[PDB]
């Protein structure tokens, strides 16, 4: 596994095995790709980040991942694939977040933006996200580069 600190100096435990920290994860994170471009969302407070969110009642992690993509980017996933899972050790609460890769089939219109500003398309992600104020803190740690390298080698990009 991988153990490092996040933007707010909280301990993050990253692994690429089939749900090692928890079999019931309360959070999801979806690395989206619309062909040759990265599909991101713009949170009203945080900024630029990959779609994600909490798992709702009578919903599984995979269901929550597809919903978060539609709720934040309004996109339909062609193939959702489990990449890994991470544990964030905060001051009081501990969060178990599931990492998913979504190959985007299409981008459709949305009626409401759930704390978001709609879909965002990037041909290539900026050189330093930890310095970039337009991006979210969830993009400003080692979870993002390690996952992209694993994703690269998966490799389902092509
Ligand atoms: N590093 C990192 N920390 C995260 C991520 N998502 C959430 N956190 C941390 O999790 C905490 C917030 O978790 P939430 O689930 O949103 O908690 P909440 O909104 O107060 O309320 P609940 O819905 O009851 O959980 C903060 O300490 C964040 O730093 C993530 O993707 N990466």
Curated annotation (Swiss-Prot):
Signal peptide: none annotated. InterPro entries: Nudix_hydrolase, NUDIX_hydrolase-like_dom_sf, NUDIX_hydrolase_CS, NUDIX_hydrolase_dom, Nudix_YtkD. Residues 6-145 form the Nudix hydrolase domain. One of its GO terms (molecular function) is metal ion binding. Keywords: Hydrolase, Magnesium, Metal-binding. According to PubMed:14761999, can complement an E.coli mutT mutant. According to PubMed:15576788, cannot complement an E.coli mutT mutant. This is Putative 8-oxo-dGTP diphosphatase YtkD. The lineage of its organism: Bacteria, Bacillati, Bacillota, Bacilli, Bacillales. The gene is ytkD.
């Amino acid at each position: 596994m991988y153990e490092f600190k996040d933007y707010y100096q909280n301990t993050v435990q990253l692994s690429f095995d089939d749900q090692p920290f928890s079999d019931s994860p309360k959070h999801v994170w979806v690395i989206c790709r619309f062909g040759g471009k990265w599909l991101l969302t713009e949170h009203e407070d945080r900024g630029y980040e990959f779609p994600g969110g909490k798992v709702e009642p009578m919903e599984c992690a995979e269901e929550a991942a597809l919903r978060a993509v539609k709720e934040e980017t309004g996109a339909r996933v062609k193939s959702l694939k489990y990449l890994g899972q991470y544990k964030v050790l905060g001051k009081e609460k501990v969060i178990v977040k599931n990492i998913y890769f979504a190959d985007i089939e299409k981008l459709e219109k949305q009626a409401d933006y759930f704390e978001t500003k709609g879909p965002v398309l990037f041909h290539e992600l900026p050189e330093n996200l930890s310095r970039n104020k337009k991006f979210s803190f969830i993009m400003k740690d080692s979870v993002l580069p390690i996952s992209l390298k694993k994703l690269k080698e998966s490799g389902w990009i092509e």
